[PDB]
């Protein structure tokens, strides 16, 4: 595994910079799109609206992320009810067969760009009920998953770390910069 740089070696490395695309763009047009691409990502990154799914006993720890101790809202994360206004879905709990068509539909109704987070073992791979006769073995069978948060339930910080991974994943989208090459 790639280990972190030592202090002395890191003592020379240049400051990272904010944009993951750097300021090394050859042309003006490319550079403007790169900077303009950051503006989109800065927007979507800032305000990520979950859907308030809350299926099973991960759902309780999905409340304590909104509790004052950790305060999801500090990061611009605001819970919402309608899937139209919701941007992210946190599938937290055991997605049984009876639910499975309902999650698919609710996910479909969510407008793009939509990212899915899988909370806990139940939604990751079927978890403790993996072999049950009425459990979908992981929600990735039904909807694409963008971040997997392990745990049972994941700690509140663990989910917070998951959300920040989604911000970083959002931060590095190349929606515009890849249109130029296309």
């Amino acid at each position: 595994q790639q280990t972190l740089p030592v202090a002395e070696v890191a003592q020379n490395l240049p400051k990272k910079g904010y944009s993951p695309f750097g300021t090394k763009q050859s042309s003006v047009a490319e550079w403007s799109l790169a900077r303009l691409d950051d503006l989109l990502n800065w927007g979507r990154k800032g305000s990520i609206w979950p859907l308030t799914f809350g299926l099973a006993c991960c759902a309780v720890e999905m409340m304590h992320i909104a509790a004052p101790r950790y305060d999801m809202d500090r990061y611009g994360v605001v819970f919402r009810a309608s899937p139209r206004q919701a941007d992210v879905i946190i599938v937290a709990g055991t997605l049984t067969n009876k639910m499975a068509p309902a999650l698919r539909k609710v996910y479909d109704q969510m407008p793009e760009p939509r990212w899915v987070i899988s909370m806990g073992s139940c939604a990751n791979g079927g978890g403790y009920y993996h072999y049950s006769y009425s459990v979908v073995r992981g929600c990735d069978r039904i909807i694409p998953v963008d971040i997997y948060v392990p745990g049972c339930p994941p700690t509140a910080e663990a989910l917070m770390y998951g959300v920040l991974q989604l911000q970083k994943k959002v931060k590095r989208m190349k929606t515009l910069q890849m249109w130029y090459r296309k």
Partner: protein
């Protein structure tokens, strides 16, 4: 009697055919994000195929295909159609290559010359170098050596490129299969 390319048991057909099975086919679907690709990829995923899905754009478009297959049976590989070093990486382990790359119109970076004839040739030429056993290509049904226009003064360029791309494919990969559809439909079409 066609020789068996490799006798390693791990690379042989196994199972009942469900998602956990294995066809012994390691496909590479160029242009899986398109309209046809959504349906080709899913049908492969049913059988148990392992597929590499190169994608030129942002991952968001192609991430939806991960549901089609099973764990470890779908892999994405960013690639640029012009760069052959990118393409070799995605075809150096495959038994089958499927070329669903094309466009109904031109772009600022890709004219019909670059996509249908030069691009498709590059995918086929690289495939032969790697040693892909099979290859599949798509082309229009009305494809002709020199198609005459009917209502638009320059409306036949798309077919001209398709015909020329068909030949170069057969030039680079002589045992390539060619399927010539006509007016495909059925959703997202």
């Amino acid at each position: 009697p066609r020789p068996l390319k490799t006798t390693n048991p791990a690379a042989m057909k196994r199972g009942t055919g469900g998602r956990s099975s294995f066809n012994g086919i390691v496909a590479t679907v160029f242009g899986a994000t398109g309209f046809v690709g959504r349906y080709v990829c899913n049908k492969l995923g049913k059988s148990g195929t392992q597929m590499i899905l190169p994608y030129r754009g942002d991952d968001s478009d192609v991430i939806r295909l991960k549901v089609t297959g099973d764990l470890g049976q779908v892999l994405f590989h960013f690639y640029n159609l012009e760069d052959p070093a990118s393409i070799r990486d995605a075809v150096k382990h495959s038994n089958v290559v499927i070329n669903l790359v094309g466009r109904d119109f031109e772009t600022k970076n890709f004219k019909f010359k670059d996509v249908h004839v030069n691009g498709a040739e590059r995918i086929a030429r690289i495939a032969r170098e790697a040693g892909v056993e099979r290859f599949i290509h798509l082309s229009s049904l009305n494809v002709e050596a020199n198609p005459k226009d009917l209502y638009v003064k320059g409306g036949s360029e798309w077919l001209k490129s398709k015909y020329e791309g068909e030949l170069r494919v057969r030039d680079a990969f002589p045992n390539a299969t060619i399927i010539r559809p006509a007016d495909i439909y059925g959703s997202e079409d």
